[PDB]
Symmetry: C2
Subunit: 189 residues, 2 copies
């Protein structure tokens, strides 16, 4: 279903208030003022703060994935697809520091829901891994589930450390060695 | 009664969550007066930190002693993966604490937890430097990135197991996790 115009507006403002103040100390009224709307307008779109948070994540992630998926199918080799995934992951977060703060630090039943949204990205990883196995790029005895956990767990840990250091350094400088490290492990490159 | 308070803290935090976990709840579960809790800890945060610090310290110490007995750097890595999974597989409530409850939004609590975690990350750093110097790992290996890969991967595997109600055997994953980290995807 297509969004109301203010929908996108509240979410954007939600990112800013949550990052700047923290999730617990964020309030619907402060999100309203930041989005430039009346408090009651927010409740037309969302029921409460946690509904804003999950809609935020669902929305941001849905586009995050489709953009990665797009950059991927206009490519040849599957290791360049992996490179594309790794660079699209870092770039999108590098392009939005406040969003990175929300997804890495400010993100119970809540956790379960966040995990469900994440499944879309994990599915994309699975597709990539299945393809690479099938075409003999990745070794064939590779467990797709474990490989997905290694890839996601590594990218997420790199990003989270960057957010902990106040997004100070160039995250996209890590694209190539992360990519290489995923492909060759500790032993090879 | 220090160890009893620690064990009780795990139980309570795992059952109720760090937020609704009250110190008087911990005292009861440990079988001591509320007052005795404050001979060791001065608040609920200090209980959580000292809990992590006590578990982690023990964990890291036992890994170090088992490694210093190993003959092989890849064996040392396997020992670390094995101990990481074995300790949590033996104590699901401790897993709930390390995987879910130690995960803070709060800046300053998260900061002090991370400080404790650094004892483990430093151990991974040492092992990685050793492996490079002895030629197990390639000489241009980025130590910090490799540390984040190993830790990020282990933590993700444990979290997915915790999220699936610990229903499969986490220790069965030691060997394939070990092989994957050493050889990568290709
Ligand atoms: Mg992680």
């Amino acid at each position: 279903k297509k969004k109301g115009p203010k929908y996108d507006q509240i979410i954007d403002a939600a990112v800013q208030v949550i990052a700047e103040h923290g999730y617990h100390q964020a309030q619907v009224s402060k999100i309203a003022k930041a989005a430039g709307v009346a408090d009651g307008t927010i409740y037309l779109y969302f029921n409460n703060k946690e509904d804003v948070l999950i809609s935020l994540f669902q929305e941001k992630m849905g586009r995050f994935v489709d953009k990665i998926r797009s950059q991927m199918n206009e490519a040849t080799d599957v290791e360049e697809k992996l490179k594309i995934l790794v660079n699209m992951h870092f770039k999108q977060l590098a392009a939005d520091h406040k969003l990175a703060i929300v997804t890495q630090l400010e993100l119970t039943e809540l956790a379960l829901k966040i995990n469900e949204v994440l499944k879309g990205y994990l599915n994309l990883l699975d597709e990539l891994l299945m393809e690479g196995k099938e075409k003999g790029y990745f070794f064939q005895e590779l467990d797709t589930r474990l490989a997905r956990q290694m890839i996601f767990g590594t990218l997420d840990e790199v990003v989270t450390n960057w957010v902990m250091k106040d997004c100070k350094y160039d995250l996209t400088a890590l694209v190539k060695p992360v990519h290489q490290l995923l492909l060759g492990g500790l032993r090879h490159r």
